[PDB]
Design an enzyme around this catalytic site. Structure first.
Site, PDB file in Angstrom:
ATOM      1  N   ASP A  35       1.267  -1.206   0.056  1.00  0.00           N
ATOM      2  CA  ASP A  35       0.015  -0.077   0.011  1.00  0.00           C
ATOM      3  C   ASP A  35       1.231   1.050  -0.207  1.00  0.00           C
ATOM      4  O   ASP A  35       1.729   1.326   1.647  1.00  0.00           O
ATOM      5  CB  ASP A  35      -1.204   0.030   1.360  1.00  0.00           C
ATOM      6  CG  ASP A  35      -1.817   1.250   1.755  1.00  0.00           C
ATOM      7  OD1 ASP A  35      -2.036   1.565   0.466  1.00  0.00           O
ATOM      8  OD2 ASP A  35      -2.035   1.917   2.452  1.00  0.00           O
ATOM      9  N   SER A 199      -0.563  16.433 -11.587  1.00  0.00           N
ATOM     10  CA  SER A 199      -1.073  15.385 -13.120  1.00  0.00           C
ATOM     11  C   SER A 199      -0.611  16.632 -14.076  1.00  0.00           C
ATOM     12  O   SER A 199      -1.354  17.474 -13.780  1.00  0.00           O
ATOM     13  CB  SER A 199      -1.810  14.070 -13.827  1.00  0.00           C
ATOM     14  OG  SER A 199      -2.552  13.551 -14.960  1.00  0.00           O
TER      15      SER A 199
END
Length: 330
Positions: A35, A199
């Protein structure tokens, strides 16, 4: 040193991925959920409340000659999905794919919430976010990657998650045969303890690319892609019959639909998520309403590039002094 381990989807939807991890001496192999959005290595154990164990493999520290109680240390964690676990702490030897760390903090669960009990395929979590998020008190502990870093050939790990197929986690090296083209790297902020990056924009299907900054985290422990409501609305508007359902808890769409791809920007590069990766199947057995793999982050507080996005790429988690993320197509 290096390590390399296969990671396998837990079910036919790729809801999560498990990776075998050797703990203790002799080894006890547990299948852990790696994770990158958390920083505790915790396991079901011989200390876990018996009614809260349902088919998981447990770690028994008393059977490990290298286990040592970390005196006074406790841990307690709550995840973004509302699940939680807590317990005490041992140090022990932990190996992943041939890479061994001695003295790793292994957090033994005394209590786990129902979602963990109900998932018999996940024996615990191995956190790979930054160690500043580790919950051990009163002395915070380091992640497996942080402990291994100095020994690694290069201070990196890579996630290569499969679509409906096994994939690979590598430590200490970049497998140049595992991706196509070049890897585009992008800056990381560690201010929140996550692999947080920006992004450069998105496209829906064959549509034009929209240049817009989207800050979010690379999180292998989250199934879906959570993005701003504007972006998610633009995606689902291209799927006839798709709608957001408060009763179901997100966007649903007709199972008869063909989904468009979703592209996200990494610098000047582009990662394309195929439409089929966005189909998470019937909301309940036999239903013709299917659950979408792109959902709004509006109620989370952060955008999350979960498995839906990451499995479309070969992803480099570069833990050098100035961390960065790398993405390549594959």
């Amino acid at each position: 040193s290096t390590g390399s381990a296969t990671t396998t989807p837990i079910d036919s939807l790729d809801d999560a991925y498990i990776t075998p991890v050797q703990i203790g001496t002799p080894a006890q192999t547990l299948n852990l959920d790696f994770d990158t959005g958390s920083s505790d290595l915790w396991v079901f154990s011989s200390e876990t409340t018996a009614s809260e164990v349902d088919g998981q493999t447990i770690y028994t520290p008393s059977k490990s000659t290298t286990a040592k109680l970390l005196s006074g240390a406790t841990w307690s964690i709550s995840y973004g999905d509302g699940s939680s676990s807590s317990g005490d702490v041992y140090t022990d030897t932990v190996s992943v794919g041939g890479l061994t760390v001695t003295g790793q903090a292994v957090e033994s669960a005394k209590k786990v919430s129902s979602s963990f009990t109900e998932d018999s395929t996940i024996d615990g979590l191995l956190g790979l976010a930054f160690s500043t998020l580790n919950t051990v008190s009163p002395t915070q502990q380091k992640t497996f990657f942080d402990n291994a870093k100095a020994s690694l050939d290069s201070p990196v790990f890579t996630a290569d998650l499969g679509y409906h197929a096994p994939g690979t986690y590598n430590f200490g090296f970049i497998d140049t045969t595992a991706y196509t083209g070049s890897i585009t790297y992008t800056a990381v902020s560690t201010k929140q303890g996550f692999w947080e990056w920006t992004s450069t924009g998105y496209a829906v299907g064959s549509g034009t690319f929209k240049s817009t900054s989207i800050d979010g985290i690379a999180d292998t422990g989250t199934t879906l892609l959570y993005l701003p409501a504007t972006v998610v609305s633009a995606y689902w508007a291209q799927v006839s019959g798709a709608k957001s359902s408060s009763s179901v808890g997100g966007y649903v769409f007709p199972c008869s639909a063909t989904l468009p791809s979703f592209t996200f920007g990494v610098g000047s590069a582009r990662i394309v998520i195929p439409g089929d990766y966005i189909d998470f199947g019937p909301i309940s057995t036999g239903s013709s309403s299917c659950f979408g793999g792109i959902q709004s982050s509006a109620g989370i507080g952060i955008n999350i590039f979960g498995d839906v996005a990451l499995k479309a790429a070969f992803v480099v988690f570069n833990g050098a002094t100035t961390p960065t993320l790398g993405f390549a197509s594959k």
